[PDB]
Amino acid sequence: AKKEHVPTWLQNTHVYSWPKNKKNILLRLLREEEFVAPPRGPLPTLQVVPL
Amino acid sequence: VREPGSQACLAIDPLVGEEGGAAVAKLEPHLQPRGQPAPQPLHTLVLA
Numbered sequence: 001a002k003k004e005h006v007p008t009w010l011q012n013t014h015v016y017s018w019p020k021n022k023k024n025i026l027l028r029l030l031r032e033e034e035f036v037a038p039p040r041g042p043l044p045t046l047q048v049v050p051l
Numbered sequence: 052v053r054e055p056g057s058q059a060c061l062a063i064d065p066l067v068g069e070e071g072g073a074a075v076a077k078l079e080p081h082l083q084p085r086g087q088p089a090p091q092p093l094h095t096l097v098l099a
Binding site (some may be wrong): 020045046047048049050051 | 095098
């Protein structure tokens with residue numbers, strides 16, 4: 001297959017390639033994100049050192 | 052001969068007003084001293 005064979009409405013989502021992306025397909029089916037974003041920390045503290 | 056008595060020459064001398072003249076004045080701005088607790092620029096740093 002090729003990119004042109006995908007129906008247009010399906011091109012708006014992730015398109016996987018078999019067997020190249022089979023790991024990604026498994027991740028998609030598991031509904032688990034491939035990258036774990038670290039938890040959002042607190043805003044940094046600002047130190048004033050006047051001149 | 053004629054006598055200069057009546058026709059004598061005249062000297063001149065201005066009536067100077069210097070005795071009552073105002074003086075030249077120098078201006079100095081009173082700097083807001085930094086020796087006194089004047090403010091400073093708040094150079095900021097980030098603790099990441």
